[PDB]
Amino acid sequence: GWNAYIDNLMADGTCQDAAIVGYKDSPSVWAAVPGKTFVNITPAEVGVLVGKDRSSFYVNGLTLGGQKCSVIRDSLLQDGEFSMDLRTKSTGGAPTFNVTVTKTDKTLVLLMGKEGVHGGLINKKCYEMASHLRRSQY
Amino acid sequence: DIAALVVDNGSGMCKAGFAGDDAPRAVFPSIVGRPRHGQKDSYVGDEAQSKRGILTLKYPIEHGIVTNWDDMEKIWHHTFYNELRVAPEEHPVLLTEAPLNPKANREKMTQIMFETFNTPAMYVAIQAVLSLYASGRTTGIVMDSGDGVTHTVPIYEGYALPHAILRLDLAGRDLTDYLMKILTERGYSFTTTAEREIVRDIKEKLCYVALDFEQEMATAASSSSLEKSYELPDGQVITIGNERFRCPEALFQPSFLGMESAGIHETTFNSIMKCDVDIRKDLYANTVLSGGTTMYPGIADRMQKEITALAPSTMKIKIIAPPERKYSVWIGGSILASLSTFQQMWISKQEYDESGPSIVHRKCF
Amino acid sequence: RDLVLEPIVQPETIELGMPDSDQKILAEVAERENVIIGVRPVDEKSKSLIDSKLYSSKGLFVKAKSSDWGPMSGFIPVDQAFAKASARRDLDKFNGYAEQSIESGNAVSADLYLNQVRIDELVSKYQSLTALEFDAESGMYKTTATNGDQTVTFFLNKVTVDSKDLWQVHYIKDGKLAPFKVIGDPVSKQPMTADYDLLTVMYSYSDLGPQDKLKQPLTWEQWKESVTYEELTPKYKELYNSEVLYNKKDGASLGVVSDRLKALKDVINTSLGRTDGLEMVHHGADDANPYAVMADNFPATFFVPKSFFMEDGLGEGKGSIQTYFNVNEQGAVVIRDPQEFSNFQQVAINVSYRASLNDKWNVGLDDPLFTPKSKLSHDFLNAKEEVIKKLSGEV
Numbered sequence: 001g002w003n004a005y006i007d008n009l010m011a012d013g014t015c016q017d018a019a020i021v022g023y024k025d026s027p028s029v030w031a032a033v034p035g036k037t038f039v040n041i042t043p044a045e046v047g048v049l050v051g052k053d054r055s056s057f058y059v060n061g062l063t064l065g066g067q068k069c070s071v072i073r074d075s076l077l078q079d080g081e082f083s084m085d086l087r088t089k090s091t092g093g094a095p096t097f098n099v100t101v102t103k104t105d106k107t108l109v110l111l112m113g114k115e116g117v118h119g120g121l122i123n124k125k126c127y128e129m130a131s132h133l134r135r136s137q138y
Numbered sequence: 139d140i141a142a143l144v145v146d147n148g149s150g151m152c153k154a155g156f157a158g159d160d161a162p163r164a165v166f167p168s169i170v171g172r173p174r175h176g177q178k179d180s181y182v183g184d185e186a187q188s189k190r191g192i193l194t195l196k197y198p199i200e201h202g203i204v205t206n207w208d209d210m211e212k213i214w215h216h217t218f219y220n221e222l223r224v225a226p227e228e229h230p231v232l233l234t235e236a237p238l239n240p241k242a243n244r245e246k247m248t249q250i251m252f253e254t255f256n257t258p259a260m261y262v263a264i265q266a267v268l269s270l271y272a273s274g275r276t277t278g279i280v281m282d283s284g285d286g287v288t289h290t291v292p293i294y295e296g297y298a299l300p301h302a303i304l305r306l307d308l309a310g311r312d313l314t315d316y317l318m319k320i321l322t323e324r325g326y327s328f329t330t331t332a333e334r335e336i337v338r339d340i341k342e343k344l345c346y347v348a349l350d351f352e353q354e355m356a357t358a359a360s361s362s363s364l365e366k367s368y369e370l371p372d373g374q375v376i377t378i379g380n381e382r383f384r385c386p387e388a389l390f391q392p393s394f395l396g397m398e399s400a401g402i403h404e405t406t407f408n409s410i411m412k413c414d415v416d417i418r419k420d421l422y423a424n425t426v427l428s429g430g431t432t433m434y435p436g437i438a439d440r441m442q443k444e445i446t447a448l449a450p451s452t453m454k455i456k457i458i459a460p461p462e463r464k465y466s467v468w469i470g471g472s473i474l475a476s477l478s479t480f481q482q483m484w485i486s487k488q489e490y491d492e493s494g495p496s497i498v499h500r501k502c503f
Numbered sequence: 504r505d506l507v508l509e510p511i512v513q514p515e516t517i518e519l520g521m522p523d524s525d526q527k528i529l530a531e532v533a534e535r536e537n538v539i540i541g542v543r544p545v546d547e548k549s550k551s552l553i554d555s556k557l558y559s560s561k562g563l564f565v566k567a568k569s570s571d572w573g574p575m576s577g578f579i580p581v582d583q584a585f586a587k588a589s590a591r592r593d594l595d596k597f598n599g600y601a602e603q604s605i606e607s608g609n610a611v612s613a614d615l616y617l618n619q620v621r622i623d624e625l626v627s628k629y630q631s632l633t634a635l636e637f638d639a640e641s642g643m644y645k646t647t648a649t650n651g652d653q654t655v656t657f658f659l660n661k662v663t664v665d666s667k668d669l670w671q672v673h674y675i676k677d678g679k680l681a682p683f684k685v686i687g688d689p690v691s692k693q694p695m696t697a698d699y700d701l702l703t704v705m706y707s708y709s710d711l712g713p714q715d716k717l718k719q720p721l722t723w724e725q726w727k728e729s730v731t732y733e734e735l736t737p738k739y740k741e742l743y744n745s746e747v748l749y750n751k752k753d754g755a756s757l758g759v760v761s762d763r764l765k766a767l768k769d770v771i772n773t774s775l776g777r778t779d780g781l782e783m784v785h786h787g788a789d790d791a792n793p794y795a796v797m798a799d800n801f802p803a804t805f806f807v808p809k810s811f812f813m814e815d816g817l818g819e820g821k822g823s824i825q826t827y828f829n830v831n832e833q834g835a836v837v838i839r840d841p842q843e844f845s846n847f848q849q850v851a852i853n854v855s856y857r858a859s860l861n862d863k864w865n866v867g868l869d870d871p872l873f874t875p876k877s878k879l880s881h882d883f884l885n886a887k888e889e890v891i892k893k894l895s896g897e898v
């Protein structure tokens with residue numbers, strides 16, 4: 001299933017979380033890393049990702065599976081790009097993590113990096129997998 | 139292992155050297171000198187300044203962004219081969235970019251570095267990010283005023299937030315024109331380019347920030363105790379009074395020049411209000427000054443005062459003025475490309491040959 | 504409280520060597536320009552000649568050595584054998600440089616005239632001439648002194664010269680007494696004194712500027728082509744007019760000289776009120792040159808900004824201090840040793856100054872001590888080590 005791709009993307013240990021979430025019609029988590037954060041993300045958050053108000057979450061932030069994140073870059077609605085870059089938010093010096101969302105023809109690919117892993121590696125992996133799936137018409 | 143080259147960019151000057159070191163090896167004005175019409179041309183730097191009386195000068199960057207790529211390549215040739223004299227295909231190269239540099243620009247930077255100089259690796263770092271790296275910090279707000287552009291840039295975990303970036307097309311050269319103008323109105327006659335460079339040196343040597351501008355204007359109107367003299371190379375002496383602080387007051391009130399624009403303090407505040415509510419506290423506590431135009435004595439205290447007057451009585455306000463901040467950016471670049479963790483951060487020539495330039499948009503942020 | 508006072512006492516040896524009036528002027532320059540100014544040691548006969556204000560001083564062309572004893576240490580002998588520090592082969596090279604100067608006519612060879620106030624200094628104050636006694640065979644008072652480790656004999660003639668009762672020095676060559684000679688100035692035909700050699704000059708990053716920093720060997724055609732006939736700084740117009748003055752001023756200064764130091768030489772030579780090419784920094788004075796032999800540098804001296812010495816707590820970092828260095832009165836500072844010098848630089852850079860460096864100081868000493876890249880780095884990069892600690896929280 002989609003979990004085979006979650007398994008594949010997590011293999012190299014750079015990322016701590018990964019998921020594939022349908023965003024069309026009513027969103028739903030198609031596949032996710034068990035026992036982590038993304039599996040409990042709700043459809044309304046996806047609706048916020050793809051919604052018309054692209055400004056409020058800059059000031060109020062948002063949570064994903066309860067982890068607060070800030071949107072750094074937004075190219076999620078641009079053809080050829082289809083990506084949004086975020087980083088998690090912490091309290092009391094607790095580590096923060098890089099997040100990448102990519103948008104294919106049918107799915108959202110979500111990745112959470114480990115401690116200190118730079119967002120660019122996660123971004124490269126997620127975009128290349130997304131390109132592979134779009135190439136597969138997904 | 140390899141000293142990666144550090145190559146800063148700027149509206150007026152350039153700074154270059156080897157990564158892992160305390161100060162730039164080499165610096166020059168980035169302008170290029172074509173003939174006036176020819177074999178014996180000298181294109182770059184102090185040589186172009188020296189020959190400037192018989193040469194035609196050009197600036198590749200205006201308001202931080204590269205324009206004439208053609209001679210940016212010449213500036214790179216002079217940096218790599220003449221100032222550091224080290225084969226840049228042999229070393230990874232750290233590059234710097236102005237805020238909001240157009241997408242195709244950063245692609246052309248990549249194309250030039252990889253196709254022309256066959257660099258084994260590179261990184262592009264935003265100057266303000268280096269400035270925050272430069273002293274103890276990964277998160278905070280940078281007020282970067284250089285020669286071209288003024289930016290207020292909140293940064294979270296080392297990542298500028300472009301949505302909240304504000305830009306102000308007002309910097310030192312407009313102040314220079316203004317100072318020449320209002321110095322003439324004091325009874326003097328500053329009008330030439332030589333006179334422009336002299337007024338520039340006066341501004342650099344004598345301006346400071348008044349804590350109470352109206353009171354200071356009153357003090358200057360009621361005596362000459364703060365007035366200074368300056369001796370021209372022709373030995374003639376001019377005197378400057380309240381202009382000393384009227385000039386930098388323009389940073390807070392551009393209306394002094396007939397401009398309908400907020401001062402840096404209010405635009406810093408508006409920048410903060412565009413940011414996540416939850417990180418502003420740290421931003422409030424990490425206000426970083428960078429650029430030669432932030433070197434005025436008294437600017438940090440006055441900024442503290444203005445924000446305090448504007449901000450909630452609860453808000454903690456901290457103005458950080460690193461003392462060499464006019465070059466702190468370059469230090470940060472040396473640091474960044476120094477690191478082992480940087481090994482992943484290298485863009486490789488192979489990635490570019492396989493995937494093309496658009497990886498820079500995905501990988502470089 | 505001797506712990507600081509011996510650090511005070513050792514500077515007293517240079518204060519014997521170098522006049523406090525000049526320490527006043529150069530301290531005022533160190534206030535007016537926000538720079539550190541180093542200077543090599545000079546010694547008390549140099550005090551006598553500086554107090555004379557009478558004569559030109561040693562330069563670049565006159566590569567002959569600052570002499571090592573007595574009256575002659577006041578000057579440079581025509582024979583370096585009377586200037587014995589370093590070894591024979593080196594004094595032979597210096598005699599080479601003398602012969603070169605003589606053939607070039609950038610040195611003449613000149614006769615040495617001393618007046619009783621100088622003798623009274625040398626015997627009484629300086630303890631460095633032995634009592635004269637008349638010999639009717641020489642028609643001169645014989646004297647002796649340990650010029651090297653050897654005591655050597657000299658015969659001194661009281662002569663009416665410029666209508667003063669000068670002593671004229673003489674020495675035995677091949678058993679015959681010959682008048683003793685020193686380097687004379689080809690222009691004034693008067694003996695060149697020792698210069699002031701300079702040690703590092705250090706500036707804040709706030710004026711780090713390549714149009715000032717760059718070191719530039721060239722000479723005439725390259726300069727006069729480089730600058731258009733009105734990209735002018737006034738004296739440079741004469742450099743358009745004359746190749747000779749360019750060769751004197753830039754060629755001797757040329758060294759590995761930075762243009763900032765080229766302007767500052769004009770500033771300092773003006774400020775010291777000397778005239779007619781009289782100077783004390785003609786050498787251009789970098790200690791970037793390849794022959795920056797180390798032990799000549801000591802004990803050294805500086806002028807530093809008044810603001811400099813009230814800046815923060817002692818014990819800056821691994822470079823640490825508890826007794827505030829070899830401070831001297833008249834605002835001056837002194838240093839005994841490369842470790843003290845290197846610590847003083849390491850602090851100055853922690854006042855965000857930038858240190859000039861040269862491998863020969865380390866090569867002189869054969870312990871790793873002056874690499875900037877590694878060793879002489881300032882503790883704001885220790886603060887980047889704290890930045891990486893933060894990232895280690897990230898990383």
Ligand SMILES: Nc1ncnc2c1ncn2[C@@H]1O[C@H](COP(=O)(O)OP(=O)(O)OP(=O)(O)O)[C@@H](O)[C@H]1O
Nearest residue numbers: 148149150151202284285286287310342429430431
């Ligand atoms: N002593 C001084 N006092 C005030 N301003 C100064 C001083 N020295 C230099 N400047 C100003 O600093 C500016 C150059 O700084 P810097 O090289 O950091 O800018 P830049 O990076 O080229 O500009 P930008 O960041 O817009 O590209 C110039 O506007 C110059 O007038």
Ligand SMILES: [Ca+2]
Nearest residue numbers: 147148149284
């Ligand atoms: Ca810049």
